[PDB]
Amino acid sequence: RTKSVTRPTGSSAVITCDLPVENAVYTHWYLHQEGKAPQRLLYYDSYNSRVVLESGISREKYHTYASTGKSLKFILENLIERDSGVYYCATWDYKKLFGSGTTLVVTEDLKNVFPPEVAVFEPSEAEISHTQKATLVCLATGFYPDHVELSWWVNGKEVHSGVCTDPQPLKEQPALNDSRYALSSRLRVSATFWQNPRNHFRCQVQFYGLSENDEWTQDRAKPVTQIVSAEAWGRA
Amino acid sequence: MRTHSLRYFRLGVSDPIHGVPEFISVGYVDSHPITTYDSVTRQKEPRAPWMAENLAPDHWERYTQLLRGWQQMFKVELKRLQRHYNHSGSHTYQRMIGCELLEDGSTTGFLQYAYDGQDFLIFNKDTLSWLAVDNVAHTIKQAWEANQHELLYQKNWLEEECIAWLKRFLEYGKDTLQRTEPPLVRVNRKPGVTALFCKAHGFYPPEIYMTWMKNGEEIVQEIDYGDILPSGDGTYQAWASIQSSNLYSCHVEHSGVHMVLQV
Amino acid sequence: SDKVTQSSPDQTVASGSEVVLLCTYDTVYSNPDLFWYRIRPDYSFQFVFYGDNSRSEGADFTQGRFSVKHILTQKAFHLVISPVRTEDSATYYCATRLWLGDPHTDKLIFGKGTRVTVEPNIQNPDPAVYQLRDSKSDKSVCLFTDFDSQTNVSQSKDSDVYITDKCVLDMRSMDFKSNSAVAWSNKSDFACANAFNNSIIPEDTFFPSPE
Amino acid sequence: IQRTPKIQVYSRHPAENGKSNFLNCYVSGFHPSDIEVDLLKNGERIEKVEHSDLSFSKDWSFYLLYYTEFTPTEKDEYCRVNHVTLSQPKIVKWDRD
Known part of the structure; x- marks a missing residue:
């Protein structure tokens, strides 16, 4: 449910609320970053149809789009590197019910962005005999923006059980500024399931990249929002 | 509380x-x-x-x-x-x-x-x-x-x-x-036989408890109570009523405090 | 109204234990409204618990496993988890509610947050290092798995070899939880035997030979 | 089903002779809100009267208080209330106890 967006520096960004009720009289907007505490940024009042901000924020930094029947939207201007984070809409039905939220990352230089390459590694013959379980490994390499969503699909259906993905990636170049990343994921299933050739396994990485509005001036292909994937079949 | x-x-x-x-x-x-x-x-x-x-x-x-x-x-x-x-x-x-x-x-x-x-x-x-x-x-x-x-x-x-x-x-x-404003408690004497009145006045929180007791022993519901009324300045007031040579004490409980007046 | 502080640092605990999260509020109100909220790795923002001087009410998902110690004299609002489960590893925040207008217009103030990691209990460790088959043919993958939660993973010595950290996966059908770590490199002198030489390797680690 | 009101006349402060004080008339427990209330000085209405705002009770009754600034002298005698539940306007005297 959580949405995600990658943007360049100096551009504007659009965020949509994900709440049980689309329209609320007062709708609040909070920002979360890894180190700092969550802070309220503003809240929209429908009766006065105006935004109420907090201290220390410019009046021409954020604004709101209020559709009659749709979920309200918040728009940010002049994106700075310190604006990266995750934004949540909130309301007060019984307590402060925060929405699914949306992640936002912004980058100064648009020539440093690369899409990830996805590879799938099949289980070892040693594990299949030592233990009755089988482990498939997914590796995504060479992506600069840490804005990816990884999923596993078995027989055409997304699987949530027996799958582990580390919460944070590692730097491909540990000492270089604006360095590319790498991420790993693991799926474990019964050896009976893996030995069946009928079963199809796929690792899908949703990469959040440039939009159609962004202009590309490089020899490489456009790092557009895409889905990279790798697949494998059962092998007795 | x-x-x-x-x-x-x-x-x-x-x-x-x-x-x-x-x-x-x-x-x-x-x-x-x-x-x-x-x-x-x-x-x-x-x-x-x-x-x-x-x-x-x-x-x-x-x-x-x-x-x-x-x-x-x-x-x-x-x-x-x-x-x-x-x-x-x-x-x-x-x-x-x-x-x-x-x-x-x-x-x-x-x-x-x-x-x-x-x-x-x-x-x-x-x-x-x-x-x-x-x-x-x-x-x-x-x-x-x-x-x-x-x-x-x-x-x-x-x-x-x-x-x-x-x-x-x-x-x-x-x-x-x-x-919170504390009450002022006073004792009054006064148809042949009369009782002594215990009166409190000047308390904003209307919660008040009043009892009579002789040397640690209360009276068995013989204390003719009086209604609690507002003074008009934002405070209230109350009164209560209870020969032999016996010592009596008036205990009154207001918000947080118990105070006793002896005779 | 001004500040809320979380004194307890981020901690790693084991399943089945009791954990306490510390929080102190600096309020002007006589009967403040305090809240405990959590953020999961999937970034879900859900209400955990609510308390005032008089009352105490929790979320539906807590299921009696969550309690709060609210002591007024010490200004303390502590979270107590008597049974802890791996489904609770997350970042916890404590907040206070400030009223300025309509109740729907109030504000929540949060602490910096405490990160709690619930390691699983591996009853029968089988520490094993495997070499995964190179499907589609530019790296080779070594996997270290089935070790107890006490063993801690450390980074590699050479910068040309990449090693990840711990990972906990729960087979729901078999109700079986396992740990894992991945390693890869590009140099031709790279093998799974020396992959995790820079970490505290258990003595009973399986190192299978090429079958 | 109407209940007759309850009259209560008293003094704001301990009534000492020749001192400024406030006489209070507290009427409560009347269901119909249309009432006539007067304060009496020597059996005559005081026109320098003051009162609080009409209030509500959780038992569906009402209460009110009337007051004025005066000086008590033992020569002077001190509520007259008329209600639909009352056949005649009833009078209450001040006990000064």
Whole structure:
């Protein structure tokens, strides 16, 4: 449910609320970053149809789009590197019910962005005999923006059980500024399931990249929002 | 750690004396009026300055509109009740809603409707139901209970909004609401045989307990109590009444404190 | 109204234990409204618990496993988890509610947050290092798995070899939880035997030979 | 089903002779809100009267308080209330105890 967006520096960004009720009289907007505490940024009042901000924020930094029947939207201007984070809409039905939220990352230089390459590694013959379980490994390499969503699909259906993905990636170049990343994921299933050739396994990485509005001036292909994937079949 | 209570009262009367209005609504934070709206002014305005200091005008605008609608609904409801009861002339219709935070820790919420001062319909927030006292009230119970969403709205307001409203109100007027003024206790002598009066006066929190006891032993309900009344300056007062040579003491408990006066 | 502080640092605990989260509020109100909220790795923002001086109410998902110690004299609002489960590893924040207008217009103030990691209990460790088959043919993958929660993973010595950290996966059908760590490199002198030489390797680690 | 009101006359402060004080008349427990209330000085109405705002009770009754500034002298004697529940306007005397 959580949405995600990658943007360049100096551009504007659009965020949509994900709440049980689309329209609320007062709708609040909070920002979360890894180190700092969550802070309220503003809240929209429908009766006065105006935004109420907090201290220390410019009046021409954020604004709101209020559709009659749709979920309200918040728009940010002049994106700075310190604006990266995750934004949540909130309301007060019984307590402060925060929405699914949306992640936002912004980058100064648009020539440093690369899409990830996805590879799938099949289980070892040693594990299949030592233990009755089988482990498939997914590796995504060479992506600069840490804005990816990884999923596993078995027989055409997304699987949530027996799958582990580390919460944070590692730097491909540990000492270089604006360095590319790498991420790993693991799926474990019964050896009976893996030995069946009928079963199809796929690792899908949703990469959040440039939009159609962004202009590309490089020899490489456009790092557009895409889905990279790798697949494998059962092998007795 | 004291029982505070937010309440809203609405009252209507059919064919009243032309001096008396037709509909009136008044709020209470600690039994002293906080707000007032009537059909003559058709405007909700505060009756306490500190509440007006900390509230935006749009609140008054919204609730003025809502109370206009509620006045119209109140009038039509009273007319329907008169039609059902075959009552002609002048009768009364009252509604009381609100919540209480008690000193023992428990919290309560209530919403009741009364006709001619007699109980007509009481809400049950835990059962989300209506207890009716009559078949005429049973008809209204059946009509209202159909709207589940409105009943859930009332219950959630009584359990999540009224308490919050009290929480902000007790801080907006903390000087006038959370203040404490100690009482002044005096003993009076004075038809052949007379008793000694124990009197307290000048306490803002109306919670007061008074007892007589001789050398640590209380009296067996022979203490003729007296009613508690307000002084008019924002304080209250009370009195109590209880030959042989016996020593007696008057014990009085106010908010937080127990004090004894000896003879 | 001004500040809320979380004194307890981020901690790693084991399943089945009791954990306490510390929080101190600096309020002006006499009966403040305090809240405990959590953020999961999937970034879900859900209400955990609510308390005032008089009352205490929790979320539906807690299921009696969550409690709060609210002591007024010490200004303390502590979270207690008597049974802890791996489904609770998350970042916890404590907040206070400030009223300024309509109740729907209030604000929540949060602490910096405490990160709690619930390691699983591996009853029968089988520490094993495997070499995964190179499907589609530019790296080779070594996997270390089935070790107890006490063993801690450390980074590699050479910068040309990439090693990840711990990972906990729960087979729901078999109700079986396992730990894992991945390693890869590009140099031709790279093998799974020396992959985790820079970490505290258990003595009973399986090192299978090419079958 | 109407209940007759309850009258209570007293003094704001301990009544000493020749001192400024406030006489209080507290009427409670009347269902109809249309009432007539007067304060009496030597059996005559005091026109320098003051009162609080009409209030509500949780038992569907009402209460009110009337007051004024005066000086008590033992020569002077000190509520007159008329209601629909009352056949005649009833009078209450001040006990000064």
